[PDB]
Design a protein around this ligand. Sequence first.
Ligand code: OTA
Ligand code: CL
Ligand code: CL
Ligand code: CL
Ligand code: CL
Ligand code: CL
Length: 298
Amino acid sequence: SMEMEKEFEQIDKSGSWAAIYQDIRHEASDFPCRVAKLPKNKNRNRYRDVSPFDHSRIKLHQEDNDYINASLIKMEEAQRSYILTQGPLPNTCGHFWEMVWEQKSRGVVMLNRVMEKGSLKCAQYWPQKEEKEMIFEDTNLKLTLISEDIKSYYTVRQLELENLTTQETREILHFHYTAWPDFGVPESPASFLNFLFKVRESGSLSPEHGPVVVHCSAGIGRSGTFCLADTCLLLMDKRKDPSSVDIKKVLLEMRKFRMGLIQTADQLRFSYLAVIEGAKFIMGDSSVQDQWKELSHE
Ligand SMILES: O=C(O)C(=O)Nc1sc2c(c1C(=O)O)CCNC2
Ligand SMILES: [Cl-]
Ligand SMILES: [Cl-]
Ligand SMILES: [Cl-]
Ligand SMILES: [Cl-]
Ligand SMILES: [Cl-]
């Protein structure tokens, strides 16, 4: 029916997802990451092969060291921005919340678990109990769990972030997709889309706020899948025209701002599936959102 559906079926028939995905890797932008590779920043990076480009990196408003492994993905035509970052390290959780503060983000999207495949993919950067708030002494921020709503494959938390210097406080929404394997895919397009539209419905993507912060362990694989689907749905929505959306071109545009977005060919295949199914809602069938909520078994 849609032009991306036709392409999807042709790629499936010819079994060429791996070759399509490798073409994207071959054509993807390459820009320098000199700040990331400075010896003083070695312990601020989780993975030595995952670095922010200098031209798009988020700078901390600190005179000491402004480096965080985070990139501003600025989608000009779609008119949506995202900050993609790695899962914070035990020594960078203060930097992480400093970035959320300085960038005026309303939401944090977390697509991984703290422990995956027997390893620590992300530091425990938010408080798990209301009565045990966290204080980040290096960046002078306080973080309190206000409430949380646990569902079968995601959790939403309300956090309070306080600048202890000025005593201003902000409510941060934490959207935690808990059933997405590292280097894997979500269990259905339905559950992925149900989650994405929860983030959308919260207002956290509004241009009145700073860019939403999106992370997985590296800030590229699952994070890239999430952002590609959202931007493609937004572009389709802006024009009310599925055919104007070239998913591979959009992914290449995003990769001008951070390397390695979408880490497997199956994640690329999955993001086609999410966009194709999300298109039903965009183009005026709001009952599919109800089917997602049911099929996902919240
Ligand atoms: O968390 C993700 O979805 C993601 O992109 N993970 C990535 S990308 C990436 C790695 C990982 C990892 O978690 O081990 C290891 C080193 N190579 C690149
Ligand atoms: Cl250095
Ligand atoms: Cl977790
Ligand atoms: Cl495990
Ligand atoms: Cl960690
Ligand atoms: Cl890659």
